[PDB]
PDB file of C-alpha atoms in Angstrom:
ATOM      1  CA  UNK L  58      27.778  36.808   2.152  1.00 55.62           C
ATOM      2  CA  UNK L  59      29.690  35.922   5.365  1.00 53.67           C
ATOM      3  CA  UNK L  60      29.898  39.653   6.242  1.00 54.39           C
ATOM      4  CA  UNK L  61      26.812  41.213   4.558  1.00 53.80           C
ATOM      5  CA  UNK L  62      24.208  40.807   7.366  1.00 52.32           C
ATOM      6  CA  UNK L  63      25.960  38.066   9.425  1.00 53.44           C
ATOM      7  CA  UNK L  64      27.048  40.386  12.303  1.00 51.27           C
ATOM      8  CA  UNK L  65      30.562  38.992  13.149  1.00 53.72           C
ATOM      9  CA  UNK L  66      30.739  37.009  16.404  1.00 55.60           C
ATOM     10  CA  UNK L  67      33.202  37.145  19.344  1.00 56.59           C
ATOM     11  CA  UNK L  68      33.928  33.407  19.061  1.00 57.02           C
ATOM     12  CA  UNK L  69      33.450  31.849  15.578  1.00 52.68           C
ATOM     13  CA  UNK L  70      30.896  29.380  17.011  1.00 51.43           C
ATOM     14  CA  UNK L  71      29.429  30.485  20.409  1.00 50.19           C
ATOM     15  CA  UNK L  72      27.324  28.686  23.071  1.00 52.42           C
ATOM     16  CA  UNK L  73      24.560  30.948  24.465  1.00 53.97           C
ATOM     17  CA  UNK L  74      23.401  33.943  22.408  1.00 56.27           C
ATOM     18  CA  UNK L  75      22.443  37.454  23.678  1.00 55.10           C
ATOM     19  CA  UNK L  76      19.490  39.627  22.525  1.00 52.73           C
ATOM     20  CA  UNK L  77      21.200  42.382  20.467  1.00 52.49           C
ATOM     21  CA  UNK L  78      20.612  42.482  16.664  1.00 54.82           C
ATOM     22  CA  UNK L  79      19.134  38.940  16.535  1.00 52.35           C
ATOM     23  CA  UNK L  80      15.685  40.396  15.634  1.00 52.47           C
ATOM     24  CA  UNK L  81      13.802  40.464  18.947  1.00 51.07           C
ATOM     25  CA  UNK L  82      10.202  41.211  17.967  1.00 52.71           C
ATOM     26  CA  UNK L  83       8.289  43.859  19.915  1.00 53.25           C
ATOM     27  CA  UNK L  84       4.577  43.901  18.968  1.00 58.38           C
ATOM     28  CA  UNK L  85       3.029  47.091  20.390  1.00 57.95           C
ATOM     29  CA  UNK L  86       0.677  46.920  23.453  1.00 56.90           C
ATOM     30  CA  UNK L  87      -2.853  46.569  22.020  1.00 56.79           C
ATOM     31  CA  UNK L  88      -4.770  49.242  23.938  1.00 55.27           C
ATOM     32  CA  UNK L  89      -8.549  49.027  24.389  1.00 57.01           C
ATOM     33  CA  UNK L  90     -10.429  51.024  27.063  1.00 55.54           C
ATOM     34  CA  UNK L  91     -13.439  49.107  28.509  1.00 56.16           C
ATOM     35  CA  UNK L  92     -16.274  46.934  27.080  1.00 55.00           C
ATOM     36  CA  UNK L  93     -18.630  47.953  29.933  1.00 55.50           C
ATOM     37  CA  UNK L  94     -18.308  50.712  32.568  1.00 59.77           C
ATOM     38  CA  UNK L  95     -17.647  49.795  36.219  1.00 62.13           C
ATOM     39  CA  UNK L  96     -18.626  53.199  37.673  1.00 58.57           C
ATOM     40  CA  UNK L  97     -21.997  53.168  35.849  1.00 57.10           C
ATOM     41  CA  UNK L  98     -22.928  49.674  37.150  1.00 57.02           C
ATOM     42  CA  UNK L  99     -22.221  49.920  40.921  1.00 55.65           C
ATOM     43  CA  UNK L 100     -24.670  52.817  41.529  1.00 57.01           C
ATOM     44  CA  UNK L 101     -27.754  51.150  39.956  1.00 59.85           C
ATOM     45  CA  UNK L 102     -27.461  47.486  41.058  1.00 58.54           C
ATOM     46  CA  UNK L 103     -27.113  48.314  44.784  1.00 61.59           C
ATOM     47  CA  UNK L 104     -30.092  50.717  44.881  1.00 60.29           C
ATOM     48  CA  UNK L 105     -32.524  49.153  42.375  1.00 57.77           C
ATOM     49  CA  UNK L 106     -32.358  48.040  38.726  1.00 56.89           C
ATOM     50  CA  UNK L 107     -30.848  44.828  37.321  1.00 57.57           C
ATOM     51  CA  UNK L 108     -29.061  44.902  33.945  1.00 60.38           C
ATOM     52  CA  UNK L 109     -27.632  42.778  31.101  1.00 57.18           C
ATOM     53  CA  UNK L 110     -25.522  44.656  28.532  1.00 57.55           C
TER      54      UNK L 110
ATOM     55  CA  UNK X 351     -25.009  36.201  27.347  1.00 58.01           C
ATOM     56  CA  UNK X 352     -27.937  38.554  28.034  1.00 60.11           C
ATOM     57  CA  UNK X 353     -31.051  37.791  30.101  1.00 58.28           C
ATOM     58  CA  UNK X 354     -34.301  39.597  29.258  1.00 60.33           C
ATOM     59  CA  UNK X 355     -36.059  36.885  31.293  1.00 60.54           C
ATOM     60  CA  UNK X 356     -34.997  37.405  34.904  1.00 60.05           C
ATOM     61  CA  UNK X 357     -38.793  37.174  35.347  1.00 60.92           C
ATOM     62  CA  UNK X 358     -39.802  36.021  38.834  1.00 60.36           C
ATOM     63  CA  UNK X 359     -43.078  34.276  39.754  1.00 57.54           C
ATOM     64  CA  UNK X 360     -44.218  37.277  41.850  1.00 56.45           C
ATOM     65  CA  UNK X 361     -45.242  39.701  39.056  1.00 55.75           C
ATOM     66  CA  UNK X 362     -47.859  39.198  36.304  1.00 55.77           C
ATOM     67  CA  UNK X 363     -46.929  38.287  32.722  1.00 53.14           C
ATOM     68  CA  UNK X 364     -49.537  35.531  32.315  1.00 54.08           C
ATOM     69  CA  UNK X 365     -52.282  37.960  33.468  1.00 51.48           C
ATOM     70  CA  UNK X 366     -50.726  41.021  31.744  1.00 52.19           C
ATOM     71  CA  UNK X 367     -52.161  40.159  28.301  1.00 53.26           C
ATOM     72  CA  UNK X 368     -55.745  39.386  29.424  1.00 56.83           C
ATOM     73  CA  UNK X 369     -57.041  42.754  30.731  1.00 54.14           C
ATOM     74  CA  UNK X 370     -55.363  44.793  27.946  1.00 54.33           C
ATOM     75  CA  UNK X 371     -56.943  42.830  25.056  1.00 53.33           C
ATOM     76  CA  UNK X 372     -60.419  43.211  26.627  1.00 51.42           C
ATOM     77  CA  UNK X 373     -60.177  47.022  26.203  1.00 52.48           C
ATOM     78  CA  UNK X 374     -59.179  47.264  22.493  1.00 51.90           C
ATOM     79  CA  UNK X 375     -61.630  44.893  20.766  1.00 48.79           C
ATOM     80  CA  UNK X 376     -63.932  42.746  22.928  1.00 49.05           C
ATOM     81  CA  UNK X 377     -62.677  39.173  23.435  1.00 49.86           C
ATOM     82  CA  UNK X 378     -65.995  37.522  22.372  1.00 50.25           C
ATOM     83  CA  UNK X 379     -65.226  37.871  18.602  1.00 52.16           C
ATOM     84  CA  UNK X 380     -64.649  34.862  16.300  1.00 51.56           C
ATOM     85  CA  UNK X 381     -61.078  34.003  15.192  1.00 50.45           C
ATOM     86  CA  UNK X 382     -58.975  31.437  13.271  1.00 51.11           C
ATOM     87  CA  UNK X 383     -55.505  30.964  14.832  1.00 50.16           C
ATOM     88  CA  UNK X 384     -56.273  32.752  18.103  1.00 51.24           C
ATOM     89  CA  UNK X 385     -58.602  30.972  20.509  1.00 47.27           C
ATOM     90  CA  UNK X 386     -60.087  34.429  21.046  1.00 47.09           C
ATOM     91  CA  UNK X 387     -63.666  33.620  22.139  1.00 42.59           C
ATOM     92  CA  UNK X 388     -63.784  33.789  25.943  1.00 40.97           C
ATOM     93  CA  UNK X 389     -63.649  30.930  28.477  1.00 39.00           C
ATOM     94  CA  UNK X 390     -66.952  32.117  29.950  1.00 39.98           C
ATOM     95  CA  UNK X 391     -70.395  30.640  30.739  1.00 42.02           C
ATOM     96  CA  UNK X 392     -74.096  31.141  29.947  1.00 44.22           C
ATOM     97  CA  UNK X 393     -75.338  34.417  31.597  1.00 45.10           C
ATOM     98  CA  UNK X 394     -78.983  33.247  31.406  1.00 50.59           C
ATOM     99  CA  UNK X 395     -78.148  29.902  33.114  1.00 54.08           C
ATOM    100  CA  UNK X 396     -75.925  30.901  36.099  1.00 55.55           C
ATOM    101  CA  UNK X 397     -78.760  33.204  37.183  1.00 54.06           C
ATOM    102  CA  UNK X 398     -81.993  31.173  36.858  1.00 56.40           C
ATOM    103  CA  UNK X 399     -84.826  32.254  34.572  1.00 57.07           C
ATOM    104  CA  UNK X 400     -86.982  29.483  36.088  1.00 56.34           C
TER     105      UNK X 400
END
């Protein structure tokens, strides 16, 4: 059990640990486009109509 | 947080209802809930039949 998943260390009890093979979680960038459109809003509000979407 | 009431005091919303209802069925008619019968006068009194 001391060699199964342990990953043997340089000094048998270290001080400050690195990042390699100590399970550093990377949750993927959650990508959403836009709730409202910026380009569709500028043209109307400066010339005339007021909105709420 | 929408706003369908950006309604300013300039336009008519109070007066909008009045002239449209007068065209469909005349306002003089008797009703229950609605205070439909018009806030008018007596046409034979304002002009004298003396």
